[PDB]
Amino acid sequence: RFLKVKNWETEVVLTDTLHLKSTLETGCTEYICMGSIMHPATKDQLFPLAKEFIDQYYSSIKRFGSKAHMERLEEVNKEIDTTSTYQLKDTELIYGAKHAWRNASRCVGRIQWSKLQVFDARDCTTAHGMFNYICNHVKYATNKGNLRSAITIFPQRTDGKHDFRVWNSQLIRYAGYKQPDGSTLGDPANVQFTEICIQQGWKPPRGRFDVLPLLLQANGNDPELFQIPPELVLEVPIRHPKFEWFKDLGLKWYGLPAVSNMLLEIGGLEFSACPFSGWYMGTEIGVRDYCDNSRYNILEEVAKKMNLDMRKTSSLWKDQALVEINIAVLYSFQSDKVTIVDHHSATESFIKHMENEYRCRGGCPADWVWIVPPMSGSITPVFHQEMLNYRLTPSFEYQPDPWNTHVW
Amino acid sequence: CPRFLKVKNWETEVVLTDTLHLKSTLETGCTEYICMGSIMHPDVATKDQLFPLAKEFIDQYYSSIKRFGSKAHMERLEEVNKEIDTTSTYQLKDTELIYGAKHAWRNASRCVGRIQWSKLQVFDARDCTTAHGMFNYICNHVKYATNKGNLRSAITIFPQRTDGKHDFRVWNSQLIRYAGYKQPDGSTLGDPANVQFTEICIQQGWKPPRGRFDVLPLLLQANGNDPELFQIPPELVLEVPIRHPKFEWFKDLGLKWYGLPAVSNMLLEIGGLEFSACPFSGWYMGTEIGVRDYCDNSRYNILEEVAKKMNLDMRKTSSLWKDQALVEINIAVLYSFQSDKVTIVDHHSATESFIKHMENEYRCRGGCPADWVWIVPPMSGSITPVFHQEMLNYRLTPSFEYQPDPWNTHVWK
Numbered sequence: 001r002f003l004k005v006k007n008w009e010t011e012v013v014l015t016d017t018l019h020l021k022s023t024l025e026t027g028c029t030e031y032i033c034m035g036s037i038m039h040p041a042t043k044d045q046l047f048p049l050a051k052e053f054i055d056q057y058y059s060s061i062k063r064f065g066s067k068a069h070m071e072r073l074e075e076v077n078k079e080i081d082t083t084s085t086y087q088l089k090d091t092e093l094i095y096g097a098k099h100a101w102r103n104a105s106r107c108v109g110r111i112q113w114s115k116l117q118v119f120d121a122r123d124c125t126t127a128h129g130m131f132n133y134i135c136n137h138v139k140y141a142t143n144k145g146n147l148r149s150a151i152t153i154f155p156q157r158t159d160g161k162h163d164f165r166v167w168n169s170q171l172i173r174y175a176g177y178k179q180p181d182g183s184t185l186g187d188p189a190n191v192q193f194t195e196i197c198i199q200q201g202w203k204p205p206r207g208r209f210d211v212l213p214l215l216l217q218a219n220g221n222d223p224e225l226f227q228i229p230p231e232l233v234l235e236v237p238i239r240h241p242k243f244e245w246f247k248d249l250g251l252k253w254y255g256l257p258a259v260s261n262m263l264l265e266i267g268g269l270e271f272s273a274c275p276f277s278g279w280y281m282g283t284e285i286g287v288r289d290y291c292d293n294s295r296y297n298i299l300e301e302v303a304k305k306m307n308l309d310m311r312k313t314s315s316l317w318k319d320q321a322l323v324e325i326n327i328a329v330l331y332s333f334q335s336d337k338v339t340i341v342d343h344h345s346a347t348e349s350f351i352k353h354m355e356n357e358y359r360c361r362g363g364c365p366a367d368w369v370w371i372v373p374p375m376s377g378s379i380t381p382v383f384h385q386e387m388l389n390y391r392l393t394p395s396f397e398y399q400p401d402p403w404n405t406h407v408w
Numbered sequence: 409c410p411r412f413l414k415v416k417n418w419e420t421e422v423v424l425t426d427t428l429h430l431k432s433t434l435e436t437g438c439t440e441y442i443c444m445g446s447i448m449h450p451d452v453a454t455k456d457q458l459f460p461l462a463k464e465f466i467d468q469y470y471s472s473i474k475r476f477g478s479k480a481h482m483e484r485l486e487e488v489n490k491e492i493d494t495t496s497t498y499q500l501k502d503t504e505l506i507y508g509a510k511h512a513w514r515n516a517s518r519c520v521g522r523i524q525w526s527k528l529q530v531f532d533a534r535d536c537t538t539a540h541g542m543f544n545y546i547c548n549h550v551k552y553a554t555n556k557g558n559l560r561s562a563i564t565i566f567p568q569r570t571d572g573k574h575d576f577r578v579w580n581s582q583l584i585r586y587a588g589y590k591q592p593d594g595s596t597l598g599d600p601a602n603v604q605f606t607e608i609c610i611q612q613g614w615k616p617p618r619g620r621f622d623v624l625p626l627l628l629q630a631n632g633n634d635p636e637l638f639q640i641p642p643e644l645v646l647e648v649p650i651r652h653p654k655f656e657w658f659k660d661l662g663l664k665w666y667g668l669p670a671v672s673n674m675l676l677e678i679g680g681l682e683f684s685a686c687p688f689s690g691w692y693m694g695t696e697i698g699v700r701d702y703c704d705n706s707r708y709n710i711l712e713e714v715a716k717k718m719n720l721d722m723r724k725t726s727s728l729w730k731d732q733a734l735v736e737i738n739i740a741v742l743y744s745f746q747s748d749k750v751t752i753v754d755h756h757s758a759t760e761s762f763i764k765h766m767e768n769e770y771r772c773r774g775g776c777p778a779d780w781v782w783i784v785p786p787m788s789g790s791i792t793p794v795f796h797q798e799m800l801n802y803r804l805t806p807s808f809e810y811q812p813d814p815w816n817t818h819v820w821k
C-alpha cells in the first residue's frame with residue numbers, strides 16, 4: 001500500500017511508496033514493536049542478491065535492460081559459479097557505498113549522502129597496508145579542519161576465516177583505564193579494547209585522553225598495533241564563551257568521527273572492514289560522550305563550578321549543566337574552524353532531506369528513536385515528524401566484536 | 409512467536425525477559441518489513457465477537473483474584489454468556505469495572521506514570537442518563553481529584569456503548585483546557601491547539617471572554633443526544649501562576665496553567681465492552697507544560713519572548729539560546745507548582761520511578777509494554793534513564809484507545 005507520514009507541527013503529509021522495495025527484516029511483528037531495540041554466503045543465496053543490486057544500479061543510470069546490463073548479469077553469474085563469489089566494478093563499489101549511507105535509517109546526516117569520497121582498498125593484503133590506507137583516509141577527511149566525508153573499503157569476506165577487520169570501534173578514540181579504587185580513568189566505553197592493546201604490547205600513558213593505537217587485522221591473521229601519526233589527529237580543547245573556568249576542566253575531543261566496526265553489505269558481498277567518517281553533531285560529544293553516566297560523566301563537576309543547587313532533581317541542575325557543556329563544544333570547534341553541526345541545524349537539514357527523498361525516491365527510511373537528538377527533543381523539527389523505518393540494501397550492519405570470534 | 413524476548417539497558421547492562429507479550433491482543437501497526445513506532449495513530453460488537461472477548465477478560469479477572477476455575481468463576485462465565493445471548497451485551501460487576509480500569513492504565517504503553525496504577529479512584533457513573541448528570545459527575549470528579557492541590561488520580565466511567573447511536577461522549581479533549589481564538593490577521597489568541605473546539609463551543613452558544621487563558625466550558629453528550637454546554641465552577645479549577653526563583657521578570661510574562669491534567673476523549677475497552685466516555689486524571693510531569701504546552705511552535709510558543717528577556721544571543725542556532733530558555737521555563741513551572749503545593753513530578757524523578765516500575769512488572773507480571781517514543785521526555789532525553797532502556801511495545805487489554813472526534817461523527821438531532 002501507499003503509506004502516509006505526517007508532520008504534526010507543519011501538518012505536511014508525505015506519501016511513502018519506497019518501503020515496497022524492502023525485503024530485509026525490521027524486527028517487529030503485527031503484535032510487537034521492537035523499535036527501541038538496538039540490535040534486533042552460498043552461490044544460490046548469492047546470485048539473487050547480486051542480481052537485485054546490479055538491477056538497481058543499472059536502473060539508477062537509466063540503462064536498465066541494456067546490453068551492458070545484460071552483459072554484467074551474465075558476467076556475475078559465471079563468476080559466482082566458478083569462484084563462489086564476485087567482484088564489483090569500481091562504479092558499482094562507489095554507487096553501493098553512497099547508497100548504504102543513503103539507506104542508513106539511523107543517520108541524521110544523510111542530506112550529504114551523495115558527497116562521499118570512496119577509497120577502494122580491495123587490493124590490501126596486510127595490516128601495514130591497512131595502516132597506510134587508514135592514515136591516508138584520516139588525512140584526507142581531516143583536511144585541516146574542513147572535514148570531508150570518506151569511506152575506505154578493504155577486501156570483502158570470503159570464507160569468514162580470512163576477514164579484514166578494524167578492531168577499534170572508531171578510528172580515533174580515547175583509552176579508558178580501570179583503577180585500583182575501581183573507578184575508571186578516561187573513556188569507560190573502551191576499557192576492554194584498551195586492555196587488549198595493553199596485552200598486545202601497547203604502552204599506555206594512562207591519561208584521561210590518550211589516543212588509542214590502531215589494532216588491525218588483515219586476511220584473518222592476528223591483529224597488529226600501529227600509532228596514528230599525531231600530526232594527523234586533530235583535537236579541540238573545549239572552552240566556554242562566558243565561563244572562563246571551563247577550560248580548567250581540561251576537556252578536549254577529536255575532530256574526526258570515524259566508525260570502523262560496522263559491516264558494509266553490497267549485492268550480497270560483505271565488507272567487514274569499511275571505516276567511514278563525516279563530521280560531528282555537537283550533542284554526540286556534548287551529551288552522549290561527556291554526559292552519559294557510563295561515559296565521561298561530567299555533569300556533577302560542571303554543575304559544581306556553575307554553583308548550582310544539586311540537592312533536588314527538580315532544580316534541573318543537570319539540564320542546566322548539560323546546555324552549557326553543549327554550548328562550549330560548539331563554540332570550541334567553531335573557534336578552531338573545525339566542522340561541526342548543531343542539533344537544530346542538523347535536524348532542520350534532515351527534514352529538508354526527507355522532503356527531497358519523498359519527492360525523488362518515494363520515501364526515506366528513518367529511525368525516530370535515533371534521529372531525535374538526546375537533548376531538547378521537541379524543540380527540534382524531527383520530534384514532530386512521523387517516520388517509517390524499513391531496511392533497504394546496500395546497507396551498513398552491525399557485526400560481532402572481533403575479539404569474541406578470533407582464534408589467535 | 410518466540411516465548412522469551414529480552415530487553416537490555418545500555419547504561420546498567422541489566423537484561424530483562426518478557427513473556428507477557430504472548431498475551432498481545434491487537435495490532436501495533438508494524439510488520440516484519442516496516443516499523444511504525446513513531447506514527448501517532450496507526451458498528452458494534454456482534455454476539456459472536458463479544459463471547460470470547462468477555463470470557464478472556466473474566467478469566468483474567470478470576471485469575472487475578474486467585475479464584476481461577478472456582479465455582480464463582482464458572483458461574484460468572486455462565487451468567488455473562490446468557491446475558492450476551494439474550495441481550496447482545498453484558499454488564500460488568502463493580503469489582504470487574506474497577507479491575508478493568510486499573511488494568512487499562514497498567515497496560516497504557518505511552519504512560520510514564522504507571523507506578524501509580526493500582527491507586528486509582530474509580531467513579532461508576534453507569535447510571536447517568538443526561539448531560540446535566542454528566543456535569544454533576546464530572547464536577548465531583550474534579551473536586552475529588554483536585555483535593556486542594558494534593559492531587560489524586562481518578563476516572564469516571566459513563567454508560568458503555570450499546571448500538572453506537574446512543575454514545576456518551578465528553579466532546580472536550582481534556583476536562584480543563586484553555587480556549588484558542590483565531591484572529592482576522594491570522595494571529596492566534598490563547599491556545600492554538602483548541603481553536604477548532606473553541607469555535608464549536610461558540611457556535612453552541614458559549615460567550616467567549618476572548619482572553620489568553622480562558623477555561624473552556626464542558627460540552628457533554630449523553631445517550632447520543634446533541635451535546636450541551638456547562639461552565640465548570642471556577643472555584644473547582646485550580647490554577648498556578650508561573651514565576652521563576654531567580655528571574656523576577658518571569659512573572660511579568662503573565663503565564664499560568666491548570667493543576668489537573670484530565671484526558672476526556674479516549675475510549676476505555678473492557679471485556680469487549682466500550683466506554684466512550686471515561687475521563688481520567690492524574691498529576692502533571694513538568695515537561696508536559698514547560699516543554700510541550702509552552703514551547704511547541706504550534707502551542708503557546710514562548711521561547712523567543714523568554715530568550716529576549718534573558719538577553720540571549722538569538723542570531724545563531726549554535727548559541728543554543730532555545731535550549732537555554734527551555735530549561736529556565738521548566739525550572740519556573742516546577743518551582744511554581746511546588747511553591748503553591750500542587751502535586752507535580754519532574755522528568756528525572758518520573759523516569760527513574762518508571763524504570764523501577766518496569767523492572768517490578770517484568771518480575772511479577774512477565775513484562776511491561778512501553779512506547780519509548782512516548783516514554784522518553786521531550787527535553788534532556790539521554791540524561792534520563794529511560795533513554796537507555798530497550799522497550800517492547802504491544803497491546804494488552806483492557807486498554808485505552810483513540811476514538812474519532814465526536815463532531816466528525818455526530819448525527820445532529
Ligand code: HEM
Nearest residue numbers: 101104106107108109112149150276277278279280281396
Ligand atoms: C557528514 C556528517 C554526518 C553527520 C553530522 C552524521 C550524524 C550522525 C549521528 C548523530 C548519528 C547517531 C550516532 C550515534 O548516536 O551513535 C549517525 C549514525 C550513523 N551514521 Fe551518520 N553522520 C554523518 C556522516 C555519515 C557518513 C559519511 C556515513 C557513512 C557513509 C554515516 C553513516 C551512519 C550510520 C550507518 C549510522 C548508524 C550507526 C549505528 O547504528 O551505530 N554517517 N550519524
Ligand code: HEM
Nearest residue numbers: 513516518519520521524561562688689690691692693808
Ligand atoms: C498519576 C500521574 C500520571 C503521570 C505523571 C502521567 C504521565 C503521563 C505522560 C507524561 C504522558 C504523555 C502525555 C502526552 O505527552 O500527551 C501520559 C500519557 C498517557 N497516560 Fe499517564 N500519567 C499519570 C496518570 C494517568 C492515569 C490516572 C491514567 C488513566 C487511568 C493515565 C493514562 C494515560 C494514557 C492512556 C496515555 C496516552 C495518552 C495519549 O495517547 O494521548 N495516566 N501519561
Ligand SMILES: CNCCN(C)c1cc(C#N)cc(CCc2cc(C)cc(N)n2)c1
Nearest residue numbers: 169170257259276277278279280281284288
Ligand atoms: C552509540 N551512540 C552513542 C555514542 N556515540 C555518540 C557514538 C559512538 C561511536 C562509537 N564507537 C561512534 C559515534 C559516531 C557516529 C557518527 C558517525 C559519523 C560517520 C558521523 C557522525 N557525526 N557520527 C558516536
Ligand SMILES: CNCCN(C)c1cc(C#N)cc(CCc2cc(C)cc(N)n2)c1
Nearest residue numbers: 581582669671688689690691692693696700
Ligand atoms: C499530545 N501530547 C502533547 C500535548 N500534551 C502534553 C497533552 C495534551 C492533552 C490533551 N488534550 C492532554 C495531556 C495530558 C496527558 C496526561 C494525562 C494524565 C492522566 C496525566 C498526565 N500527567 N498527563 C497532554
Ligand SMILES: C[C@H](O)[C@H](O)[C@H]1CNc2nc(N)[nH]c(=O)c2N1
Nearest residue numbers: 036037038369370795796797798
Ligand atoms: C534503548 C535505546 O534504543 C538506546 O538508548 C538508543 C536510543 N536512541 C539513540 N539514538 C542515537 N542517536 N544514538 C544512540 O546510541 C541511541 N541509543
Ligand SMILES: C[C@H](O)[C@H](O)[C@H]1CNc2nc(N)[nH]c(=O)c2N1
Nearest residue numbers: 383384385386446447448781782
Ligand atoms: C511524530 C511523533 O510520533 C510525535 O511527535 C510524538 C513523539 N513522542 C511523543 N511523546 C509524548 N509523550 N507526547 C507526544 O505528543 C509525542 N509526540
Ligand SMILES: [Cl-]
Nearest residue numbers: 109341346349
Ligand atoms: Cl551536516
Ligand SMILES: [Cl-]
Nearest residue numbers: 521753758761
Ligand atoms: Cl509520578
Ligand SMILES: [Zn+2]
Nearest residue numbers: 028033438443
Ligand atoms: Zn515497530
